[PDB]
Scaffold this active site. Structure first.
Site, PDB file in Angstrom:
ATOM      1  N   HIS A   1      27.303  21.419  12.908  1.00 39.63           N
ATOM      2  CA  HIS A   1      28.255  21.144  13.924  1.00 39.63           C
ATOM      3  C   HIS A   1      28.615  19.816  14.480  1.00 39.63           C
ATOM      4  CE1 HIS A   1      27.783  25.843  14.234  1.00 39.63           C
ATOM      5  NE2 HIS A   1      28.541  25.639  12.972  1.00 39.63           N
TER       6      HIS A   1
ATOM      7  N   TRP B   1      32.464  20.664  18.806  1.00 37.94           N
ATOM      8  CA  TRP B   1      31.078  20.522  19.446  1.00 37.94           C
ATOM      9  C   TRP B   1      30.913  19.038  19.844  1.00 37.94           C
ATOM     10  CZ3 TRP B   1      31.978  23.443  14.899  1.00 37.94           C
ATOM     11  CH2 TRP B   1      31.808  24.770  15.021  1.00 37.94           C
TER      12      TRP B   1
ATOM     13  N   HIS C   1      29.180  28.297   3.442  1.00 37.83           N
ATOM     14  CA  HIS C   1      29.282  29.953   3.293  1.00 37.83           C
ATOM     15  C   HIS C   1      29.112  30.379   2.128  1.00 37.83           C
ATOM     16  CE1 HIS C   1      31.711  30.957   7.377  1.00 37.83           C
ATOM     17  NE2 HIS C   1      30.552  30.081   7.618  1.00 37.83           N
TER      18      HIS C   1
ATOM     19  N   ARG D   1      31.831  23.374   5.425  1.00 37.73           N
ATOM     20  CA  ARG D   1      31.757  24.941   5.747  1.00 37.73           C
ATOM     21  C   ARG D   1      31.926  25.594   4.571  1.00 37.73           C
ATOM     22  NH1 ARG D   1      36.585  28.343   7.821  1.00 37.73           N
ATOM     23  NH2 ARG D   1      35.478  30.461   8.284  1.00 37.73           N
TER      24      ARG D   1
ATOM     25  N   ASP E   1      24.365  28.337  19.137  1.00 37.59           N
ATOM     26  CA  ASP E   1      24.085  26.865  19.411  1.00 37.59           C
ATOM     27  C   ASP E   1      22.989  26.992  20.577  1.00 37.59           C
ATOM     28  OD1 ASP E   1      25.869  25.840  17.513  1.00 37.59           O
ATOM     29  OD2 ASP E   1      27.277  26.270  18.941  1.00 37.59           O
TER      30      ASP E   1
HETATM   31  C1  HEM Z   1      23.491  28.552  12.690  1.00 37.13           C
HETATM   32  C2  HEM Z   1      24.463  29.550  12.516  1.00 37.13           C
HETATM   33  C3  HEM Z   1      26.058  29.126  12.368  1.00 37.13           C
HETATM   34  C4  HEM Z   1      26.923  29.735  13.387  1.00 37.13           C
HETATM   35  C5  HEM Z   1      26.881  31.084  14.294  1.00 37.13           C
HETATM   36  C6  HEM Z   1      28.253  29.007  12.931  1.00 37.13           C
HETATM   37  C7  HEM Z   1      29.370  29.480  13.329  1.00 37.13           C
HETATM   38  C8  HEM Z   1      30.611  28.672  13.334  1.00 37.13           C
HETATM   39  C9  HEM Z   1      31.539  29.312  13.489  1.00 37.13           C
HETATM   40  C10 HEM Z   1      32.066  30.560  14.282  1.00 37.13           C
HETATM   41  C11 HEM Z   1      32.718  28.298  13.075  1.00 37.13           C
HETATM   42  C12 HEM Z   1      34.067  27.976  13.509  1.00 37.13           C
HETATM   43  C13 HEM Z   1      34.978  28.445  12.043  1.00 37.13           C
HETATM   44  C14 HEM Z   1      36.497  28.150  12.498  1.00 37.13           C
HETATM   45  O1  HEM Z   1      36.989  28.846  13.649  1.00 37.13           O
HETATM   46  O2  HEM Z   1      37.016  27.338  12.026  1.00 37.13           O
HETATM   47  C15 HEM Z   1      31.807  27.212  12.313  1.00 37.13           C
HETATM   48  C16 HEM Z   1      32.569  25.948  11.723  1.00 37.13           C
HETATM   49  C17 HEM Z   1      31.778  25.174  11.190  1.00 37.13           C
HETATM   50  N1  HEM Z   1      30.506  25.261  10.753  1.00 37.13           N
HETATM   51 FE1  HEM Z   1      28.997  26.553  11.496  1.00 37.13          FE
HETATM   52  N2  HEM Z   1      27.902  28.158  12.056  1.00 37.13           N
HETATM   53  C18 HEM Z   1      26.598  28.088  11.704  1.00 37.13           C
HETATM   54  C19 HEM Z   1      25.842  27.480  11.051  1.00 37.13           C
HETATM   55  C20 HEM Z   1      26.125  26.339  10.240  1.00 37.13           C
HETATM   56  C21 HEM Z   1      25.813  25.563   9.269  1.00 37.13           C
HETATM   57  C22 HEM Z   1      24.178  25.864   8.703  1.00 37.13           C
HETATM   58  C23 HEM Z   1      26.721  24.705   8.747  1.00 37.13           C
HETATM   59  C24 HEM Z   1      26.471  23.550   7.556  1.00 37.13           C
HETATM   60  C25 HEM Z   1      25.182  22.950   7.628  1.00 37.13           C
HETATM   61  C26 HEM Z   1      27.695  24.682   9.415  1.00 37.13           C
HETATM   62  C27 HEM Z   1      29.003  23.806   9.263  1.00 37.13           C
HETATM   63  C28 HEM Z   1      30.165  24.111  10.123  1.00 37.13           C
HETATM   64  C29 HEM Z   1      31.096  23.192  10.065  1.00 37.13           C
HETATM   65  C30 HEM Z   1      31.115  21.966   9.449  1.00 37.13           C
HETATM   66  C31 HEM Z   1      32.248  23.914  10.764  1.00 37.13           C
HETATM   67  C32 HEM Z   1      33.392  23.472  11.211  1.00 37.13           C
HETATM   68  C33 HEM Z   1      34.756  23.646   9.996  1.00 37.13           C
HETATM   69  C34 HEM Z   1      35.891  23.056  10.691  1.00 37.13           C
HETATM   70  O3  HEM Z   1      36.208  22.054  11.447  1.00 37.13           O
HETATM   71  O4  HEM Z   1      37.014  23.495   9.653  1.00 37.13           O
HETATM   72  N3  HEM Z   1      27.787  25.698  10.361  1.00 37.13           N
HETATM   73  N4  HEM Z   1      30.618  27.498  12.409  1.00 37.13           N
END
Ligand code: HEM
Ligand code: ASC
Ligand code: NA
Length: 250
Positions: A163, A179, A42, A38, A208
């Site tokens: 995810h 997820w 970001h 993440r 998603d």
């Molecule tokens: C497609 C649009 C996306 C949306 C709307 C989105 C949204 C989110 C949200 C709301 C979270 C939760 C953050 C939290 O509360 O800790 C999250 C976590 C995460 N996102 Fe996404 N994301 C997107 C795309 C991506 C992409 C492109 C990647 C990397 C390739 C990614 C990797 C992750 C990971 C690995 C987490 C988990 C973080 C943790 O467990 O601390 N996401 N994302």
């Protein structure tokens, strides 16, 4: 041929390799690969091709960018990595955080993403608001990934498969839950869970679910749920592109 990578010194390359080894150990030992993916995402996903602002240029180290709502909790990631960064002063933060993202995917069993050094640390963060809104749908995903970042629909679906790692936290995004049942394993389970519908103990965001209803995204979801090798290939290509937005463009 869209890229012309800069020449860096042998010492820079040696620092990349030694930092990679320390990152691999720390990320595995501290079970923080999802947070580090993440962090890298970001960092990179703020690029807007029309102004060439944002992107993977080290600005996540800047407190003003860490304060963006979408970056809640990334201050933990920055702090966790700073002891390693202090050992590699030659590296840009820009390169270091993208390297952390590549390593996060590796240590969780995902594909080996190529890494090319040389990104500069730029002084100005992007404006807040470039990253995708989890409550929106396919048109929004195409504006963010397509019109801003310049990535394809295939890249959108493959990158959503990130995810497969980690979870949402109520104090960070405000969503809550993982997820997948194996949030430290990089596999194609995210797509399988999407296809099976919602189930107790797992989360799906509106962003998603938009992949299931869109006529171009859905065949990719089906493909990746059935074929982990195809997912890994397309994910590798998409993550490479993401990690290099605005960098080394020919
Ligand atoms: C497609 C649009 C996306 C949306 C709307 C989105 C949204 C989110 C949200 C709301 C979270 C939760 C953050 C939290 O509360 O800790 C999250 C976590 C995460 N996102 Fe996404 N994301 C997107 C795309 C991506 C992409 C492109 C990647 C990397 C390739 C990614 C990797 C992750 C990971 C690995 C987490 C988990 C973080 C943790 O467990 O601390 N996401 N994302
Ligand atoms: O992926 C993550 O790693 C840490 C913690 O789980 C282990 O360090 C964190 O808060 C996550 O979001
Ligand atoms: Na998983």
């Amino acid at each position: 041929m869209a890229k012309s990578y800069p020449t860096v010194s042998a010492e820079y390359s040696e620092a990349v390799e030694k930092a990679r080894q320390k990152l691999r150990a720390l990320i595995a030992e501290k079970s923080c690969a999802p947070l580090m993916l993440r962090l890298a995402w970001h960092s990179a996903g703020t690029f807007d091709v029309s102004s060439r602002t944002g992107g993977p240029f080290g600005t996540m180290k800047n407190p003003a960018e860490l304060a963006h709502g979408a970056n809640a909790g990334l201050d933990i990631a920055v702090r966790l990595l700073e002891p390693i960064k202090e050992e590699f002063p030659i590296l840009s933060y820009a390169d270091f955080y993208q390297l952390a993202g590549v390593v996060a995917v590796e240590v969780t069993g995902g594909p080996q993403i190529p890494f090319h050094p040389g990104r500069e640390d730029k002084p100005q963060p992007p404006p807040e608001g470039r990253l995708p809104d989890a409550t929106k749908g396919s048109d929004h995903l195409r504006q963010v990934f397509g019109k801003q970042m310049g990535l394809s629909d295939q890249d959108i679906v493959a990158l959503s498969g990130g995810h497969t790692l980690g979870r949402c936290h109520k104090e960070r995004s405000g969503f809550e839950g993982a997820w997948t049942s194996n949030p430290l394993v990089f596999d194609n389970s995210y797509f399988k869970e999407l296809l099976s519908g919602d189930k107790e103990g797992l989360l799906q965001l509106p962003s998603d679910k938009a992949l299931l209803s869109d006529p171009a995204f859905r065949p990719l979801v089906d493909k990746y749920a059935a074929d982990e090798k195809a997912f890994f290939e397309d994910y590798k290509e998409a993550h490479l592109k993401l990690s290099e937005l605005g960098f080394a463009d020919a």
